[PDB]
Structure formats: C-alpha cells, structure tokens
RNA sequence: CGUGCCUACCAUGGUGACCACGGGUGACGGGGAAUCAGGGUUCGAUUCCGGAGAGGGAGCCUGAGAAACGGCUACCACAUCCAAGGAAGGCAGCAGGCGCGCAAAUUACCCACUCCCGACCCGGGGAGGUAGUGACGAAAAAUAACAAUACAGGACUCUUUCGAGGCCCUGUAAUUGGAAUGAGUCCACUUUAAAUCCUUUAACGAGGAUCCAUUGGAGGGCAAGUCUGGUGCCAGCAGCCGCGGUAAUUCCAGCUCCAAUAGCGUAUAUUAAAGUUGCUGCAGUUAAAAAGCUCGUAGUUGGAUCUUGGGAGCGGCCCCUUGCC
C-alpha cells in the first residue's frame, strides 16, 4: 500500500464491538486518538448500537455536532472520536452519566455512575522522563502528558486524575496485595488481587492474580490496571466484583432465571 | 524391511516421493506430456469443423461399420475422428458444420467395439443430436 | 465488495449404494407409514440422527468429569427433552444411541396431529397442514416438517379458517348457483 | 376493532422525542394504512396527529401482529430538524422536484470542461 | 472404406404406432402412497415363494 | 537510520548430498474449501489479512505519505482527429462492445442503509445499496388431492352363514360434497429514496379439453419384460461383460413396469471406494520385485548399569536420599 489506511471492514472489525454481518460492508474506522484501535470503542457504536439512542448513524452526527455529548467534561465534535478503558462519558441536557469498564465476558457495558464520580478518573502510568531544565514528566495510556507529577511514582503505577483542572491527586503504587483489573488478552474483564509477579530480563514480566473464591489467572504487565488499595476498589464496579462465573455457572444462572 | 526410527522422516518422504511416479494415474496427472499431447487441451468439450464423413471397421467378435466425422479443431488444430451416436445423425451432419464434441468413458481409451475413435458428437450448429433425434427443433 | 452472507448446509445425504432391495423396502414402508413426500425428507431425519450420534460419540469419548462433556451432554439432553424424543428419565448418553429413526417422524407435526385428532388420515392431514387449517398458539403454521416442542404439544386450534372460523370460500359458488 | 400497543418506549430529550415499538393487532382486516394508525396513536397519547411519525412493517403470517417504529415529537421545528428528508417527503415538507441522474454529473463535466463566466452560463442554463 | 449409404435404415423402416392416450399418473406424494399400498398392505395374503412385479 | 547500499584498501572467503546452485509450474501466499473410522489426498483466480501491476519497461515533480498511472517525461507496440502545420490517448474501476473460446448478467434506479473525504449538521461517492438476467449452488415446498356414497379385484376378527362388516387396501375417465386451497387475473395497504418482491385482505379462480412432471432405464453388475410388431453380424445398442448372422429377455417403435423427483442424463478435473502409494497400512521363492559379492563415509539405529522400601495423618505431606545454599 501507499501510506496510511483510511477504511476498516465490518468483518475485520474487532469482536467486542458486537457488530452485525448483514448490515453493511464498512465498519466505522475510529479516528486516530489516545487509544489504540484494538482496545477502543467508537462513539457512533456507543450511541447507536448499544444504548439505542439513535437508529441511524447520521443522527449521532447530528446530536454530537449539536454539542449534547461531552467526553471527560468537554464536547467532542467528532462522530468517531475513539474512547478507551476507564473514560468519563457525560451527557448534558439529559441527566445521564457513563463510565467505560469491562464486562466479565470481555465487552464494554453501561455503568450509570453519578457526577461525584464524573469528577474522578483513574489512569495508568505508561512511562516517566525528564525534559527541559530538569523537570519531570509522566505519560498516561490515555496520552496525557503531565509535568511535575511526584517523585514517588513507579513506572507501572496508577494515578487518579481530575478532569476539572487536569492535575493529579491521590496516586496508588504497584505492590503485592493490590486489587487490579485486566484490560487485555484472553482474560480481560477479570478483577483480582496481585499475588506474585515474576520479572524476566526478556522484556516481558508475568503477574499471577487471585480474586474472591480463590480462582487464579496470569497475564502480562501492559494488560494490568491497578484498581484498588488492598482489596478496596477506588471505583464502583458493575455486577459484583465482575467475577467470571463458569460456562456451567452461566447456564445454572439462566436456568435459575 | 521398512525403516521405523524417529529421525527417518526424510528418508521416508524422499523414497515415497520417488516411488509415487511409477503409478500411471499420477504420472499422467503430473507429467506434462499427457496434457500437451492429446487434443481438447484437458477440457471437457471442443468445437470443430466437419472435414469429411468416415466409416470405419469394427473389431472381430462384433463386425460392423461405425460412422464418424473427421474434425479440424478450432482450438488446437489437430484432426480427430469422432463417433456419431444414433441411427440417423449422419444425415443430420453435413459438410463443414460447427460441431461440439466430448469423450466417451475415459480419455485414454476408446470404446470396446470401436478401434481408434475416442470422441462423441454432442451438438451440430448449437443443437443437440438428442433434440435432432426425438423430434426437437431442427438443424 | 459485497457482504451479505455465504453459508450453506445440506440437511440431505445421498446414501452410497443406489439399488438395495432391503433399503428400498425399509424406506418405502417408512414413507407409507408416516406419510412423507419423497425420500429427501426421509434422509433429512437420517442426517439429523447421524449428527446427533456423532455428537454423542464425541461426548462418550471423553472422561466423565470433563466440563465440556458435562455441559454439552446436558445441553443435548435438554434439546432432546424439549423435542420429545426422550423421557425425563434416562439422562445417560448411551440411551441417545439407543434411539431409533422413527421417533423424529413420530414427533413431527402431522403425526402428532393425527394422534391428537382433528386430522382424519395422514394423507389428508398433509392437505390440512398445507392449506391453512392447523395452528400453533398465535403463529399460524404452513410447514409440514415441524418439530412439535413437548412443552407446547397441545395448542392446535385455528381461527378464521373455513371449518372452524367461518366464511364462504367456494361454497359461495354453490350458493350463487342455488340462487 | 384494531389494537395498537407500545412495547418498548425510549425517552430521548437529546432530540426532544419519544420512540416506541408499535404492535398493531389483526384478528380481522388487512394491514392498516398510515392514516388510522397515526390517528389511533395520537388519540391514545392525546397529542396532535401532524407530528407523530411511524415507519417499517412486517406481517406475521395470517392476521397477527405488525411491528413498527414510531417517533413522537413535541415541536414542529424539532420534527423538521431531526428527521431525514425522505420521511419528510411523506408529508411533503421537503422536495427536490426533479431527481434525475446525468444532470448533476453532466453539470460536473461541463463545468470541468470550461472555466469561469461561460462555465456559470452553461451550468446554470 | 465401406458404404456410407445405409443410415437410419431401421428407424426409417420402423412402422409408426400411434401414441395412445394414458391417464395422468399421480405425482409425488400420491405416487409414493400408491407405491406403498400396491405392495405392502394387500400382498401379504399372497405367499412368499413366487414373485410377479411385471410379466 | 543499521548494513558490501556504494567507493577505496586489505584478508580469501560463503553454500552444498541434512539436497546447494539451476530448470518447470496450466504457483500469487495465508485464514480456508471439497472429501466422512482414524491417518490423509486434492484445490485455495475470488468478498478477510498481506503483496504486486495498471499495454511492456525506464525516469520524475508535488506532497507527511507515490517511482502514483481516472499525475507527469521519453522509447517501444497499438490507436484517434487532422486544414498535414500538429493535438489528445491507457476500462486488469462501473455498465456496454470486438476478439477469444467449452465457459459467463442491464450502457438501469438511489445516496435512504453501511461507512469514507473536504472548510464542513447541508456537498459528493458506478465505494456501496435496490431492482432486472440468473437451473452456479442451497433451504422450504403443491404439482390436483381429500374424507366420502356405491360396484366389489377381494384380504381380514370369526359364526354350517352362500356375511355381521361401528376395520380395510385399491381399480373405479362412476357420482357427491368439503365445493377445502393454491398457481395465475387483478383493487387497497404495507414495503422503499422511488417503486418491486414476500406477508395481509377484498373480487375471480377444478372436474379429466383438466390449471397435464419429466429425466433416464428394464440380460448380469443394478432396482425393473424370458410382453407385442418390424429389423436379419445390416442397422445399431452397450462406460465393461457382451447382443444382433429369421423367433433379439439387449437395436427400432407401442404397451406395462422400475428409480429419483421440480432435476435427471452426459463429458471432464478431482476425492473416497484404493490395505491397487500402504507411517498407522502393501509386496519382493514361483505372479512385478532382494543389487553378483564385499568394504565403506554421510544418513539411520545403538546392550545393561547410577534415588529405596517407609513414616505422620485420615479415609495430599516429610524421610531413614525429597530442592542445595
Ligand atoms: Mg489498495
Ligand atoms: Mg475403457
Ligand atoms: Mg570494490
Ligand atoms: Mg502464473
Ligand atoms: Mg472427511
Ligand atoms: Mg482427517
Ligand atoms: Mg486483496
Ligand atoms: Mg502501484
Ligand atoms: Mg487509482
Ligand atoms: Mg481506466
Ligand atoms: Mg438410452
Ligand atoms: Mg425396449
Ligand atoms: Mg433385478
Ligand atoms: Mg453409457
Ligand atoms: Mg500389492
Ligand atoms: Mg516366470
Ligand atoms: Mg518374476
Ligand atoms: Mg556412518
Ligand atoms: Mg542404552
């Protein structure tokens, strides 16, 4: 090919957008943004498909450019501005407010938390550096660059970030015994306590997690988002602690009805 | 006296790949001379032009004279005697007509009663001999 | 390019031997008993039975404590219970292999209709299920080879239809002649 | 005689509208036209008939239920602004009055041939 | 080599016979029904030695 | 940017019987498809990922991004208009045409869905979507039945019955109804951008001229004719075996049957059948096959032997060896 692509096929769309076969040939390709396309979620899919706010796609383009939808406190003019894990979606004229977390199966869900939690947002530290004249800098997976954060922030930590002023408040570090949530891989949407991490010099460390009722998984560092401080979640979480049940437990739940 | 060690997969594959050639079906499937020697170019049917009407002998336990058409091929350019099936149809074939032809039962062999004719006439001037036989349309 | 769907399942198997005297007699007496159309909708039942037998042997292959064996075994048993081939009893996998052919034909639409009356001779039941004269709950049925689910099994009652609903569909001819 | 029920009822004050899934029942007559459905829904919601829109219908194989999507609008400005113009076209508010091809494209190629004033001349008349 | 004169000799010399009227054979389901009823339900009085499906 | 990517100097190296190098491919590669014990074998032009090329082949400006071709420059091969002085061309984009063949659809409608681009809620999109052709293939499925009355070709429970028939199968070109209901003929809704198609509903719409199921076959394999008339090793049939030379169970016709059924015959590539390519799983005295014999490297295979009984505790842990520091 010649330069960057500019489309995306409906079949080539990722699985968790819950898109259909017979509908159309083209998937919405999300805009270039602060989240990768394998992990993102388009606004046209969010308003159109799941919430059933708008039947057609064009109605979403009408309402967003009539300024009803804001992301992280401010209005995004785009119809396909990409979202990400742990982002604030607020809606102004109708009293409604949304949070993006993961279902136990691996999908985005609806979580109608209040304006008190609209104020507060979590985020993961990507890396840390120093710039001009000896000042520090922290980089977020949400592509926030913030200077003078703290001296006591490790690379793989979690910062609670404010969307009013954009300045940090009340960080939390990475330690054995913290409650984390999985954002990637085959076990996404799993919430559990970090048990034991193994460090390899081969650039990819592993982490074992346990949760309530003792089931244990394992994953890699970039798939990990620290959510709590010693089995205490900072943010309310949908469907219990979001534990994956079993195939048999899902069947028995739907038989219990 | 086979070979059965764990590290002998190369010897087994090379010996089987050598000994696969002596089968006649495989060697005429994947040796080029079977494709580029016969007519039809490996296809089902071919068109041609009637060159002449030829009667040929039959074999010895059953003696008759079979009725065939010599054909210049449109596609390749090789001359072919082709058998004309039913009671009539020698009257239905005239000189210099577009004739569609096919094989009989296997392309490497003729039929039993016929010496060297390998080919069967299906249509003449885009009309089948079946339709020409049981009252259907015309030439 | 275009994207609508491309998927194609043949619920249909040509048997291998073409001309078997015993096979022809068995399928002919099967046709004559359960009143079918042609042997393609006989071979439908054979293909469904073969699919269920392959699933059953793949389940009997694995170990008893295996979660896939437990889940798919209970699921196949629930499907067969909802159809009405099995009892609510023998939930082993080997009884599924103990099943014969005729059970699916016995649990078709028109055969259960003929057992439940209002039918009068299977070949006339063919007409009664084609011409809109036999129903199921609130969605009126046209199709003969229907799988009567055991939990419904009873609601065969048909409104706005010539022997039960009312109307002059072709007796209008006779009574205009009697005018 | 005919019965209209609403199954699923969305409130959308982003658009100032209310959406519903409409089941029209039929033990009797054929599929009801656009007029009487609109009047029966406008009476059972007690609003004006010229502002409620409804579209899309199947039929469940012998009498049965026909399922539709119904927009209920408060204001006529919101009706004119939030609707597609083809659903305006049933009530006649929007028209283009000559929907032919080769017109737009032959104007494009004649404007691509020449330039400026005579371009405006040929492309406008 | 041999003479190409005789062609369609037998089919020409064959005397024609008028294709007399047949009743319409019942089709599909009704055909299979009389296939069943012709041999499975009233041939059990006959004995199992001889066979007579056409003669 | 890293590099024999290129220059200069210096060293003489690198690969290969574990298949190098070189030819062939009717070879674009995968995700996949067909084929059913298991193991495989044969395709993958093609809707998704990725690569390549816009007649061959070379060069280049702009631009973040091209060796772009619905951008440019020259040559070669075509080819248009020429007032002969010169101009423009690139459908392996969408329809459509010529040629080639065994082999393939309408110069349609629309941005309403899907998404994409631009300054931008509005523009535009043969990308797409809808209709028309469409027996590539698939699914579901009537084709005139259906219960009847009557005649019985007569079977069956059984009574001397030479029949009670509260069961029956079937032929009734026999009658009667349900005159069931459909295909077509058309109003009106809906469907849709605009229609169409399906569903719904009104009015028609069946008594054998009906509103008509064919395709093959009837010696064996192989289900089904030792029926009839012609034909006389002629014609012809037959995938093989074979038939035909005056009685043809096989040709040609008619009649009766047989098989599948809105799909059957044919030709061809190919898979199973084929344990007739065999690793599971073949042969090698005589049928095809053990080299004339022996040494011999690469390959392949390679004797035995080095950590054990127990203990605690019910009904997995430690040691008397059981992770060292
Ligand atoms: Mg491309
Ligand atoms: Mg042969
Ligand atoms: Mg040099
Ligand atoms: Mg090639
Ligand atoms: Mg298979
Ligand atoms: Mg296999
Ligand atoms: Mg591609
Ligand atoms: Mg290119
Ligand atoms: Mg291009
Ligand atoms: Mg072009
Ligand atoms: Mg024949
Ligand atoms: Mg005959
Ligand atoms: Mg036989
Ligand atoms: Mg043949
Ligand atoms: Mg052998
Ligand atoms: Mg010998
Ligand atoms: Mg020998
Ligand atoms: Mg050696
Ligand atoms: Mg050893």
From Swiss-Prot, chain A:
Give the source's domain of life in one word.
Answer: Eukaryota
Give the UniProt keywords, A-Z. Answer: Ribonucleoprotein, Ribosomal protein, RNA-binding, rRNA-binding
- CDD domains, A to Z: KOW_RPS4, S4
**Any single Gene Ontology cellular-component annotation:** cytosolic small ribosomal subunit
Q: What InterPro entries does the record tag this protein with? A: KOW, Rib_uL2_dom2, Ribosomal_eS4, Ribosomal_eS4_C, Ribosomal_eS4_central_region, Ribosomal_eS4_central_sf, Ribosomal_eS4_KOW, Ribosomal_eS4_N
A Pfam family matched in the record: 40S_S4_C
Q: Extract one GO molecular function annotation from the record.
A: RNA binding
What the entry lists under PROSITE patterns is as follows: RIBOSOMAL_S4E, S4
May I ask which residue range the UniProt record assigns to the signal sequence? none
Annotated GO biological process: translation
Q: Which residues does the UniProt record annotate as the domain S4 RNA-binding?
A: 41-103
Transmembrane residue ranges: none
Homology family: Belongs to the eukaryotic ribosomal protein eS4 family.
Q: Tell me what this protein is called.
A: Small ribosomal subunit protein eS4, Y isoform 1
Tell me the organism.
Homo sapiens
Source taxonomy: Eukaryota, Metazoa, Chordata, Craniata, Vertebrata
Its gene name is: RPS4Y1
UniProtKB/Swiss-Prot annotation, chain B:
Q: Name one Pfam family in it.
A: Ribosom_S12_S23
MF term (GO), any: structural constituent of ribosome
Subcellular localization:
Cytoplasm, Cytosol; Cytoplasm; Rough endoplasmic reticulum; Nucleus, Nucleolus
- Disordered: region residues: 1-25
Q: Which UniProt keywords apply?
A: Acetylation, Cytoplasm, Deafness, Disease variant, Dwarfism, Endoplasmic reticulum, Hydroxylation, Isopeptide bond, Nucleus, Ribonucleoprotein, Ribosomal protein, Ubl conjugation
Its PTM note reads: Hydroxylation at Pro-61 affects translation termination efficiency.
N6-acetyllysine occurs at: 134
* List of residues that carry N6-succinyllysine: 53
Q: Which residues constitute the cross-link Glycyl lysine isopeptide (Lys-Gly) (interchain with G-Cter in SUMO2)?
A: 36
- What is said about its interaction partners and assembly? Component of the 40S small ribosomal subunit. Part of the small subunit (SSU) processome, composed of more than 70 proteins and the RNA chaperone small nucleolar RNA (snoRNA) U3.
Instruction: State its role.
Output: Component of the ribosome, a large ribonucleoprotein complex responsible for the synthesis of proteins in the cell. The small ribosomal subunit (SSU) binds messenger RNAs (mRNAs) and translates the encoded message by selecting cognate aminoacyl-transfer RNA (tRNA) molecules. The large subunit (LSU) contains the ribosomal catalytic site termed the peptidyl transferase center (PTC), which catalyzes the formation of peptide bonds, thereby polymerizing the amino acids delivered by tRNAs into a polypeptide chain.
Recorded protein name is Small ribosomal subunit protein uS12
UniProtKB/Swiss-Prot annotation, chain C:
- Give any Pfam family that matches: S4
Give the record's GO biological process terms: cytoplasmic translation; positive regulation of cell population proliferation; ribosomal small subunit biogenesis; translation
Q: What SMART domains would the database entry show?
A: Ribosomal_S4, S4
The record, for PROSITE patterns, names: RIBOSOMAL_S4, S4
Protein localization:
Cytoplasm; Nucleus, Nucleolus
Task: Write down any Gene Ontology CC term.
Answer: cytosolic ribosome
Cross-link annotation Glycyl lysine isopeptide (Lys-Gly) (interchain with G-Cter in SUMO2), location = 92, 138
Query: What are the S4 RNA-binding domain coordinates in residue numbering?
Result: 107-179
Q: Which residues carry this modification: N6-acetyllysine?
A: 65, 115, 154
Domain of life, per UniProt, equals: Eukaryota
InterPro entries referenced in this protein's UniProt entry, alphabetically:
Ribosomal_uS4 (IPR022801), Ribosomal_uS4_CS (IPR018079), Ribosomal_uS4_euk/arc (IPR005710), Ribosomal_uS4_N (IPR001912), S4_RNA-bd (IPR002942), S4_RNA-bd_sf (IPR036986)
The alphabetized UniProt keywords are: Acetylation, Cytoplasm, Isopeptide bond, Nucleus, Phosphoprotein, Ribonucleoprotein, Ribosomal protein, RNA-binding, rRNA-binding, Ubl conjugation
User: In the record, which positions carry Phosphoserine?
Assistant: 152, 162
Under the GO molecular function aspect, what terms does this record hold? RNA binding; rRNA binding; structural constituent of ribosome; translation regulator activity
Keyword Ion transport attached: no
**Record carries keyword Transmembrane:** no
What PANTHER family does the database record attribute to this sequence? 30S 40S RIBOSOMAL PROTEIN, SMALL RIBOSOMAL SUBUNIT PROTEIN US4
Q: How does the record describe its quaternary structure? A: Component of the small ribosomal subunit. Identified in a IGF2BP1-dependent mRNP granule complex containing untranslated mRNAs. Part of the small subunit (SSU) processome, composed of more than 70 proteins and the RNA chaperone small nucleolar RNA (snoRNA) U3.
Recorded family membership: Belongs to the universal ribosomal protein uS4 family.
Can you name this protein? Small ribosomal subunit protein uS4
Q: Which organism is it from?
A: Homo sapiens
From Swiss-Prot, chain D:
Q: Where is this region: Disordered?
A: 89-125
Output the Gene3D superfamilies linked to this UniProt entry: 3.30.70.3370
Crosslinked positions (Glycyl lysine isopeptide (Lys-Gly) (interchain with G-Cter in SUMO2)) = 34
Under Gene Ontology molecular function, one entry of this record is: structural constituent of ribosome
Family annotation (SUPFAM superfamilies): Ribosomal proteins S24e, L23 and L15e
Q: Where in the cell is it found?
A: Cytoplasm; Nucleus, Nucleolus
Key words of the record: Acetylation, Cytoplasm, Diamond-Blackfan anemia, Isopeptide bond, Nucleus, Phosphoprotein, Ribonucleoprotein, Ribosomal protein, Ubl conjugation
Q: What GO biological process terms are annotated to this protein in UniProt?
A: cytoplasmic translation; erythrocyte homeostasis; ribosomal small subunit biogenesis; rRNA processing; translation
- Keyword set includes Endoplasmic reticulum: no
Checking PROSITE patterns in the record gives: RIBOSOMAL_S24E (PS00529)
Xref: PANTHER family = 40S RIBOSOMAL PROTEIN S24
Disease the record associates with this protein: Diamond-Blackfan anemia 3: A form of Diamond-Blackfan anemia, a congenital non-regenerative hypoplastic anemia that usually presents early in infancy. Diamond-Blackfan anemia is characterized by a moderate to severe macrocytic anemia, erythroblastopenia, and an increased risk of developing leukemia. 30 to 40% of Diamond-Blackfan anemia patients present with short stature and congenital anomalies, the most frequent being craniofacial (Pierre-Robin syndrome and cleft palate), thumb and urogenital anomalies.
Could you give the subunit structure recorded for this chain?
Component of the small ribosomal subunit. Part of the small subunit (SSU) processome, composed of more than 70 proteins and the RNA chaperone small nucleolar RNA (snoRNA) U3.
Q: Which family does it belong to?
A: Belongs to the eukaryotic ribosomal protein eS24 family.
Report what the protein is called. Answer: Small ribosomal subunit protein eS24
UniProt lists the gene as RPS24
